[model samples]
Target: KTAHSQGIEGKAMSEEWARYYPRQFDSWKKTKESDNITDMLKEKPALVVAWAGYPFSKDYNAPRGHYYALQDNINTLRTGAPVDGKTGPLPSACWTCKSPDVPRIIEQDGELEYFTGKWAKYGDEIVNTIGCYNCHDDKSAELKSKVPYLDRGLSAAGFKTFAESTHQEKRSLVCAQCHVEYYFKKTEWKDDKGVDKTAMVVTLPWSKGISTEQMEAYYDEINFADWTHGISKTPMLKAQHPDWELYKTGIHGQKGVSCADCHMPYTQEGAVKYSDHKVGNPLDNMDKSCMNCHRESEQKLKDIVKQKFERKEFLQDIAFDNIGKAHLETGKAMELGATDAELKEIRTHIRHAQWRADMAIAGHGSFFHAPEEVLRLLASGNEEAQKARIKLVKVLAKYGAIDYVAPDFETKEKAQKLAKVDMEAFIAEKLKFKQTLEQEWKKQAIAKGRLNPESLKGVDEKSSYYDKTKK
Candidate 1:
């Protein structure tokens, strides 16, 4: 009987049939209701101000379950409202991490060409959200890293290819494919054979290392910037989520524990053991996640997680205030006619401060993955932010500006107003666009013979995909 015929709700946890079980995806849905940090940002408008000129200033929601990937991206204001035949603000490359269809398209179009053009250009093609093909080989039916951009990114960062990675390392590297620091570096570098490429490559600036300071040094060497701050006008670097990098500095990582070790701990059902695919907070499965090593009581372990989380939050609170103050003060100095040369140190301080702050904040679960390192990075951010503010104050005074009035950013509405974001129209257009875009994508997908269940019958049953002997 088929899994569904037997009342199983979703695909098995592992590709290997020896590890197959009922309702694996349904069990994973429990984390869909997990709380996110984005809700907190609505109460603290300083975050919006921090990202003033950026698309994030308009709408920065916390991440949700993997199932919401395609839906969430379509709804996000950052993607803009691609209506009728108009292209959105984002590039087609934006869909690369959002869907498994990206790999399929990349196969048809050259890799470099695939990364070009507007997001709407590939809207119909990118119908599916992240799926098995993203992190596994369909033919081999084995878990493997697939994103070529990630390979290019790691290569640029001076890391060896995924083929050279240890088995444990691959576990984390697979996650790092989408959850790591990256930037669209607008420049061409000579290839190994001295061939020039003219694409805005997605690069990871980890050549020096993965530390906050090390990445900063790498960006500085290249003079690369994500954007100039709207308030401070300082060339700033935005740190993408760097969970894998931060995790690498932790004790567990040093001890050779992979991301799968905690997030996808091995669970047994009857006589079979399989890696749990419900990847989520380790605390949710304390028996397998924590008791595997630390012999502490559940409450004690909870307390440990809380303490580290609180420390990270404590440093972040101070860092935010200082950074916000620096932005406001720098803006005031500029209003008072402060020259670019005069504001150089203030801008440099703000740049480094924000980058340091983001390093800790961007690394999701860093509090649990590497408590000490998170604290250190946050503290550095706090210190640098304060230094920037102090310098800005002196500059403002020299410019004869007695009163450095700060803008009102106590609420989300006020923050959006300050950023000049049209929240109402943004929401309206996004909703209107999604009404037809998604439906059309589904129609096209069906027409192209994609998303067919029958094609997967062999793989789902007994095939080379499963190592049956392992059972």
Candidate 2:
């Protein structure tokens, strides 16, 4: 039966034909057009601040087209926009995900040369397209790859798995960017002065595997967190999106369906059918999308989608409630004079809960696409968050701060204010520091005379690290 949700939108110019989704279209354009870091830096200061001690704190541009990947990294704010010779902004390892500039620099200079210096130290040397070479072995044309797992001993810790057990796992590989959890090692970048400076090597937090409880248990065992909460003073974890990790818990994953099977469905162009390179949500092009394999009418698919969304929405409400509870209890603990040890346990709860929740719902499409798994992740996260909150209440009760719910934390501004951000004052101080850095960069650039462009020119843009010796 044709359901009510399955009506077709008439052709090309009709309003019904296209939804004119501003956010999606804008994301689509930005994902492909903006080439330079300067093209996006001004608009995303929050990201700049998030990395704080990291190079990304210095400069983080929105991911504008994948094509400008190499060029954008060279001139990006994080890489020290060498005006004269301020050395480029980051380390050779910084080139890891940014471009083919990485493999070349790593070749010219071993991991020591590539990784030993500040990003700005060799900005000129590492500049190339973020292209096929970055992810391939030209000789084999297979998806050649390298991760610093062996060096860090992470692979030994059980984080490493053999390459591509199934096509589904491969489909989730692209989602590893930004969607994965990571940490930076300080010892690797310790300066001569005994300070770890400007060196942030991204390492995934998957040593424990992809389960919420397992990862949380590992983080607790390590007693790690992103930062101390500004408002509650609780140890807090800033969850990076876990798009693929969360997907593993969902229905589609259990059903053995791959993301590419849906998002990049094969299309026959006069006998050649290939996976669409434009990675995105399947709903964006439904007619040519899900309909290809599933024998369902458009309305039926829409119903499934809506049902999935509704389930996620319900789970989200539960998770958000836990968020509120955690905040309240953390506040109560502090008010009631909880000791450092007591607060530590409380923070662990908050950290794990939030991380699990964040990972569970990172991608918008995953909810319906994999509802059952999404719910499992959410349920587990809710349990952990609530458990943390309950502990906080007990601690608060003992300390005589009963009934102390956190004050007005609905928005980030309110939360920051409660946390004592001193917004206006902080902004002024930051602005002054940025101005000083700008002058320093310009002076250095002039002295350097675009050596970056020269150094970078020596390497082949199409050479992958695994096959750098090839022509």
Candidate 3:
């Protein structure tokens, strides 16, 4: 009666399920093929100005596919090699969405234990990258959504859990487990010895509605700020990937369409028409994805998506230009001795503007996913950034510094210099961290039998991480 019971019983690794679901598993293998190697910080250098104080200002890239998820995390400059694991900028929760090893760790250790450490604490154990176990139960056909943070978020939002949701909803809910916005929650607690400690728990902010403004209000109510703007010194909110939340505001969401509708539309291999497991842009398989109902030529449908992107891209230009300049102008005001009281309102505008702009585009697919809502968010973002500049101009005049000239928005080097990030020093430290500490993590994981050395995908061949012999 059971066709899938032939695999290793209680197996958690993805390769073990291949025999039973060969077609799907084979398609899943394609996740390793995308080489999204663009250095976004250079392509859109305004990010350097916007995320000035954060590690993101140092390096941000168009993410590689899931196969390289864990590796990319280690290789990126943003994570910054905390050689001792305990001193890293990111918390353990940063690894929560990257691999199936997380859920296993949550079960073996405690959920609290899993989410309460440094990113390097689990570095060796999370070697598998994203795999079948991330979305499925090893023992059954029942879909899985056991991520505690996501579960808590849904309940807080008064939404149904996986078991209570319709089968149609399950298709999308499974993806939401990682495709949503989340934050590291710091809670003060006492251990067995009564020593007080702060634990970083991965939390989803959905106590309010899922809209951008609603989440902004929710964060403000809790007085949460991911990090302070380095230039303006304002507490700022960084929008995490909000694909699920942004999708909810679009036409497809209102019409009862789910994420899987486009991202994993059905494919007929021989006689059996099953949902494609490749999980990528629907544009790649237009007939099965868009033509299923849109009933139009591929060319026409693309233009629709293209035009929306054109609209959003241009809108982003305005938002970033204003916000990027606003940060420079505020820093100008400070140089002329502007008071905290005078800068307070300007900082507030900067925070709100950046948060809205970030939420609008962070999802990546939002332009095609929810065109109207993105424009709505972008308009307000640009407006607020200008508001800060308007208020900043008055501060400059009051301080008698009317002739201040902002940095010519040039290369990332110039911008980082303005942000005061020592670029060469950061690069040196990361390379030094990699030559020893990074390799050790991989070696340890292989020794623990958690990693198959051959499963390691190709690296950025041109990057420092590829050169084990490098200084």
Candidate 4:
């Protein structure tokens, strides 16, 4: 039986994710219910400010479970939906991030039809399933299923129609589907002749490059902003999850490690062996997780993972500090009558510098697993941020504003307030929204008869698409 037929996601998560890693599954499931909504949390304010005006600033978090899909969306501040109103909280587009049923619904009903409705309209339909098909191609029965957006990106870049790359790329690409940043084209849909009309489509900002600065440039080139910053008034930029993209810069990526390598390792039962589908960090179970491949003792591998985590964390700490500092520096440049062109450069620096940091920190296992590459990316970010700060100081001096830090900046909050993110507001919204969204989710689950549902468990069943003979 296909894993999809069994309700597994992401190539069945190696065998380790399946039966052998209950602790790992338990830890992951715990995240969905975390009540520790603190501003002191690294990601809370840093990301809210970075995405400052996007739905993410309103509500975003490390994703938890396939089951928590609906609940998570309902809880985000981005929608800011009226919980009891007929108008509904947001567009049906919100459902895009919640489940794979979206692909099926859009396929059956038409793309525009899927994109045109209110978020609540299909709440019942998507309440249950967010499984294999969300990232898989049922028709082709392939592991490396082609997500619509990836295809769009390739097509936009002037490629002929394409298929996915490999079982290896497919491992991480599944998460890449929803985790990566994208936006609706919002352009007028038209006939083949390119006439006036509305079209619902997805596009990655990667046309410029995957780096923060590149994306910033791409946004500026398109004059795009998720929203005008509430305080800074500069058109803002939002960084999407670039985990897989950023992870590539690390030792694991260099060594060609796949998500399944860690998140889903293989496990052997008395007589049966299969890839585990319970997705989570591999560190939760080092024995079955990494021991199979490396002959090193548990402590040695654990130390390596720990070192990587610390390095990644250190870099992320710097990144957060740089955001506030960048805002202050850039705002000062503007206040000093810095021309629009000059401010644009300042923004570019802030953007690129932060992007490196964000991408580095964003890599899933960088903190505890791949320190060398993670640290390298973060160090790059640190340099980028400092360089921007230095340039800003000189510009300020030209305006007779001298005596900048001259170097040696701290990653502390004092340095960050220069960015002007209201930590209080950021924290409060997160708390209220988490509770509200969970309630919204629970209600949907009940209404849709999914309060205690289970996914249909699938295995790698015989299929023409998969060469069993090769195995």
Candidate 5:
């Protein structure tokens, strides 16, 4: 019988198809794209100054759904506009987190080689976005799952086995594979078999711990910096989305609440209950998602969520503005011939403040994930930024530089102008690449059999793995 015959809204599908179909929904349109860092930074254009000398200043967009990963990466100017067979500025390593084809290539070819080439080299190969094989086994009737590279990361960081974890803990671990903070450790390391591997390894900084302080310390100990700031010359660390890490420190985590319990709450469909696969705001379906725990009215729960976000948002704004001031102040000091030794302490402040601020803001929904921790980090950032500004005044006065001028951080275009970016050239190059290089990649993908529709097949239809119809 069809799902409609059983009183379900959609037609019946194979379990595999049913599991993957919800991923195609446009539900993410209402939340993810609107709450992008690009829009936030546009409101406070000083972020461009803070991330000066970085590609983020060139083009940063709000993250959409998984479906747009490939499209967004290609469209963004950060990857650079590659034309013909010439390589883009970015390496193939950029695609590691963006596609399932990354793992396919790694398995078929080699992990090191997959991570070695230029981003444009693999454009044809990495056509598919996140898919079933990314998180599921092919032969298993029950969906046995594992995220590649994450297990090695967990084990390397001295974490326990996934098998030993509680079912609830395992639920969040899968999402943590991509959701947590990570850095590309540009060094080689040995695999479990003691074989030497050469590639820029994606490593979770959990040796010291998972908190902002711990990760910061871990990076410092290694003398690692994502980039040296253009103004301050501060060795800076860019915090990736540390949602899973921050979430783990929250009350929900303490109570053994999994990410799925809230964000992917179960929904009833006829007699079957399936997890709502649309990963989104819990408030969107408060009755189903939050009512399970709180006995309060829907309005009360909403108020609570809103209050947390409001406090965090206010702190975030203050920190970002102050940090922007610090960056410009450092630039001013340099223009006035400030020495490296003289600006040392000021640089330290910029590094610590921005790192803390990025930690608090980078996490997608960190305010709710861990309110106390988020607040703590933001407050620290605000304090550090103020300290940097305070030191900047003395340095300026000593050097006969009496005034600190603030730039007009009113819009992205203005920000780009301040950073000396040519948007016209960037867009033109990107369009040329799309017409020439990108089209050629698609043709190559088809010729190489990488883009075949049959490549998407999972378990065979005739397999004896619990044929629902036969049953």
Candidate 6:
């Protein structure tokens, strides 16, 4: 990767790689938070009902960017830190994708060893935010797989190993290491001493295939469910971002185009040409991304994108409304003393409907990644949800009440109230914990020489990417 022996070889942070590639390094810094963040729950209150039992229902933001990976991970209520800032409710698997310190640890111990434990177990160990070490080789600077669970996912998709994939496939595959949908798997086995042991490991659901129905089949066979729905009493599945999986079923994948083709479009700066490492929505620069093949005015291209969003949003509204109603109706049915045998098929339908809806909704890019496929999933989910609601009414009627009143989710605050989420307590506790967390973590990391002692930024930075950038 280099002609002569350079001292920068095998360094974990991008700060080491920056001296040789200023533009690339500089472009990477833009991953920091800009003014683009939005509260997803506030923007769409329906999600509060959809994700009622999950922490995401408490605080879901339109992410800042990769730059805040560690910062946001520490700050978000989704992790649920104790006031003492030590006992976190999340597993270490949650932090695997947030920092390069992960593969650095796994490179020595292994995937399972690094994966099995508390979220705070590796929080102190991982001082660097994601950058060079996650995507490229530390030694040769060649692009390679640093994710241990990645090859396992590739195996189910017909790739026996990462080594078997072509360079282009590896480009998208690397993204899948984090971007795909997954579930935290809990396993029980006896140890050598007859001790009953349990492990919570993050696992990709790609073994059945990356399709909506196919992944559901995999989860069903394994009897995996993330949690029980707060209102419906039905088993629930929380869909993580599935951009890579959804993209594969689109025109881009059929045309053999990689994510880097659009999200990381190649750019020319003076005498040099390099892939723009901004890693963002392709719409951010259509002249450079989408216009690479389709020649049209930028506004017209944006209009086309918006047109798709409009149709997708229209379906999303209908689909989620029905799903939330189904959840409410199921809760009503149970309140009316509906039997488990009577509600069995109803719960199953509710589960499938919500799973499909969430699979499309959580993707964050399915509208453009695979427009028709997204619509299909939404349509299927809408139908399934309505089916569940219909069954629920029959049960309600059987229980001597034809009038079942569903709670109004007109606003996020009202919805959270109905869902029994104490936003006041959740926020106050998280704020206090966050304050203590930064102080304790930064102090420990700096003293251990794992972080810069210059500021309490909680991540490594050569340029002022977070605080002083102002942009």
Best by TM-score: 3
| Model 2 C-alpha lDDT per residue in residues 63-174, reported as the tens digit of each score | 4445455545543434443333334434455556665546555655455435565655554444334444444343343444444432243353453342634445555554
Q: Write the per-residue lDDT of candidate 4 for residues 279-346, one digit (tens) a residue.
A: 65566677777877788888877787676666666667677567656656666666668786766666
Clashes of each: 0, 22, 0, 38, 0, 0
C-alpha positional error of residue 401 in candidate 6 after TM-score superposition, expressed in Å: 2.2
Q: Residue 135 CA error for candidate 2 (Å)?
A: 2.9
**Higher-scoring candidate on lDDT, 2 or 6:** 6
Q: Give the Å shift of residue 148 in candidate 1.
A: 2.0
lDDT of 3 by residue, 1-471 (tens): 246644354345677778778887877768776655677777778878999898888877776567777777777777787887697778888788888888889888777777777888888888777778888876675678868787788888888987788988888898899999888888777766777767799888899978998899999998889888898788889987799999988999878888888877887779987777777777878988888788767998898899999999999989988999889889889888888899998898999999999999888898877999999899999999999988888899898866676775667777778777887777788888777887888899889787777667564343422334321
Give the per-residue lDDT digits (tens) of candidate 6, residues 21-117.
7787888777663435567787778888888888877878775567777766776778776544337788778887887777878877666666666
Better of 5 and 6 by lDDT: 6
- Cα lDDT tens digits for candidate 5, 234-331: 88889888988899899998888999899778878799777765666678788888999889899988998899989998998789888987887788
Q: For every candidate structure, what is the RMSD over all alpha carbons to the true structure, in angstroms?
A: 8.2, 12.8, 2.7, 9.4, 8.8, 3.5
User: Lowest-scoring 10 consecutive residues by lDDT in candidate 3?
Assistant: 462-471
Alpha-carbon lDDT of model 2:
0.52
Weakest ten-residue segment in model 6 by summed lDDT: 460-469
Give per-residue lDDT, candidate 4, residue 263.
75
Question: Candidate 3, 233: how far from true, in Å?
Answer: 0.6
Off by over 4 Å in 2: 1-95, 98-100, 111-130, 146-179, 187-200, 363-365, 421-471
Candidate lDDT values, in order? 0.71, 0.52, 0.81, 0.56, 0.71, 0.78
RMSD of 6: 3.5
Q: For model 6, what is the error of residue 221's alpha carbon versus the real structure, in angstroms, after optimal superposition?
A: 0.8
Query: How much is the lDDT of residue 253 in candidate 4?
Result: 64
Model 4 segments more than 4 A misplaced:
1-60, 83-91, 117-121, 135-146, 154-164, 190-200, 206-235, 254-256, 333-342, 367-373, 394-471
By lDDT, the better pick of 3 and 5 is 3
- Estimated TM-score per prediction? 0.85, 0.65, 0.94, 0.71, 0.84, 0.92
